[PDB]
Structure 1
């Protein structure tokens, strides 16, 4: 059919993104988009790959995201929807490889090592 499955992970988050033709229906975990992400700039960051590919009005969007942090789930959707947009063709492939959206951000947290206190901070001597 026209249902399109999109996943995306960033900072231990995971978002199921479904994409199908509709009229601006943006719903996440049975919540509105302005209601879910309370008072942040990432309310527009989830639209940034969408408005780049000039399809902001032409699809239903159904998002289910689990785990992660507050602004880590918003990055999971942004990576998640870019994989769902490229199930169509590779016309928007070059519009997103150049945009720097398709690559999953590999930067994950680092473990505490013995002798040190943080991942790299160490106590003071004299």
Structure 2
């Protein structure tokens, strides 16, 4: 039984396990509301479930580590999508059009020598 997905987002990673169940959801062994408190993180972590309309049928066990709250939510979504793909591997198109299977490669640009930030410069008075 079960299915395993590995999601990754913004220096954060997530291990997700899908089993037969009734949508229990548990992240780091605590409830979804206790983890993502009143924001769109619930929406983003649930998106593939309702798009595939299998929110009620799967029991989910998640362990996430690294990054910030939004990055962790993105990791959960990515892992969930990959595990859902491997479960019933015929709806790759359905997620593909939604852009969930693609892994976002954006990362924090490094600081450069002589500059303040990665791109900001000092003021440049010419006189």
Q: Provide TM-score, normalisation by structure 1.
A: 0.95
Secondary structure of the structure 2 residue equivalent to 1:61: strand
1:79 is displaced (CA, Å) by 0.8
1:3 is displaced (CA, Å) by 1.3
Q: Which structure is higher in helix share?
A: 2
Identify unmatched segments of 5+ residues in structure 2. none
1:91 is displaced (CA, Å) by 2.2
1:45 is displaced (CA, Å) by 1.2
1:31 is displaced (CA, Å) by 0.6
1:92 is displaced (CA, Å) by 1.4
Per-residue Cα deviation, 1:96-118 (whole angstroms, up to 9, x for no partner): 11111000000000111111110
1:90 is displaced (CA, Å) by 3.1
How many residue pairs get matched? 125
1:89 is displaced (CA, Å) by 3.3
- Structure 2: distance between partners of 1:24 and 1:80: 16
Per-residue Cα deviation, 1:67-97 (whole angstroms, up to 9, x for no partner): 1111110010011100000112332111011
Instruction: Give the 4+ runs in structure 1 shifted more than 6 A.
Output: none
Identify unmatched segments of 5+ residues in structure 1. none
1:17 is displaced (CA, Å) by 0.3
1:24 is displaced (CA, Å) by 1.3
Question: What is the RMSD computed on CA atoms of the aligned residues?
Answer: 0.9
